[PDB]
Amino acid sequence: RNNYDGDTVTFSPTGRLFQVEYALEAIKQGSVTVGLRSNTHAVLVALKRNADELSSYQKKIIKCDEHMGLSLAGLAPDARVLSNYLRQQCNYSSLVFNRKLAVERAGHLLCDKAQKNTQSYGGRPYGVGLLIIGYDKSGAHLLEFQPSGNVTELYGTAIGARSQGAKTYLERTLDTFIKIDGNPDELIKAGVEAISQSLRDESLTVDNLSIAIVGKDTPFTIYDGEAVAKYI
């Protein structure tokens, strides 16, 4: 019961709120992404989904700043907002502090952003999961942002539909991709494998793969179409 799920200002007797778990479910309902990283590079590989085959996909990678960027999973209306604010914080750091904003602190402001609508009546916890990758002073990072606002520094994680199979690919091979350095291609190879296990009833196309990379001397670059046909 569950008469309690209609307000986000009401708790359950089981010590939950219902709206926040439901916002968690909303991620799964959307597309799929796998993040993983190495000490000198960070990579997101994400599946683009289209409405029909005259439809030409949905851009799943939003470039944040030239040292950070993120992927989305779940509802898009939600993603556009969260992204905007995050970009705003990276541009603020660059102007006022002459810094490339740390991935850890940036992820932490997002956790604080999520709680602003959770507490207050009206608004909602956001219904999108974000995987943020970046390269700062302390080298490569991959953060997993959640609806709740729980932020988790990981070597590899995957969110979205049937993402448990990517974590199984990543878990087996955990120590192997940490040891890769200096070779972006090989982190992409690992990512391409990963996102294969996630799929059901599909096969990778030159326009399903969208591969996003940031590292030491490489700025953030999003590969699309004819730049993902070296790793198809």
Partner: protein, 232 residues
């Protein structure tokens, strides 16, 4: 629109091969009255920077508080901060550059001349000017206030340009700042005998020397001056 009530005068600084010197007399002159003794211009910030502040002691205090909250700001939300996203002179300078301008735009000028001297964690010598007109410039040698007119030429012998930095050493630079002080003591009214001198090196770390006294004292030529121009 503030006007200076009590003011510090002169901070001198120079570049040398393995780090920098910043130095200044210790005085809070209430105009013609030498009001306050033991006022300390040089504030260590982080541990790789000393920011020296001349101008309104009233604005100085306020800047001191903002500087202390910048150190505290870096600790917050960082697993560590002593080399991860450690506080550089440059970050501090940029944080100050923005606020002096912002205040200038509201027409309540923080009435100061500020030199930020430090060393980066990248091995790079940093030495830069900001003031209450919100004017910024980077230069190998700096000086503020009276000391711009007076003492800065003298240091410009020691280093004219940025290819005589490797041929200037720490004993020699130290020698030049103290002769620069001697001269400020003689020929400037709002300059005291008292002075502090800090050496930030990227290898030796911070040395803060307090309560040095001007020496190499010339007054023994004074008995041969008789009259104003004509008098036996």
């Amino acid at each position: 629109t503030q006007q200076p009530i009590v003011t510090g005068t002169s901070v001198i600084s120079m570049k040398y091969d393995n780090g920098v010197i910043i130095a200044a007399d210790n005085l809070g002159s209430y105009g013609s009255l030498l009001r306050f003794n033991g006022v300390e211009r040089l504030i260590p910030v982080g541990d790789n920077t000393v920011v020296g502040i001349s101008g309104d002691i009233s604005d100085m205090q306020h800047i001191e508080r903002l500087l202390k909250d910048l150190v505290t700001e870096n600790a917050y939300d960082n697993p560590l901060a002593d080399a991860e996203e450690a506080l550089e002179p440059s970050y501090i300078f940029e944080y100050l550059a923005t606020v002096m301008y912002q205040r200038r735009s509201k027409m309540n000028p923080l009435w100061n001349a500020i030199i930020v001297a430090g060393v980066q964690s990248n091995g790079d010598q940093f030495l830069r000017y900001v003031n209450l007109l919100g004017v910024t410039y980077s230069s190998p040698t700096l000086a503020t206030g009276f000391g711009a007119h007076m003492a800065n030429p003298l240091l410009r012998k020691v280093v004219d340009r940025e290819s005589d930095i490797p041929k200037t050493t720490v004993q020699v630079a130290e020698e030049a700042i103290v002769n620069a002080m001697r001269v400020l003591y003689y020929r400037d009214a709002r300059s005291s005998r008292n002075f502090s001198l800090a050496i930030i090196d990227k290898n030796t770390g911070l040395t803060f020397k307090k309560n040095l006294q001007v020496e190499n004292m010339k007054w023994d030529f004074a008995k041969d001056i008789k009259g104003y121009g004509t008098q036996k």
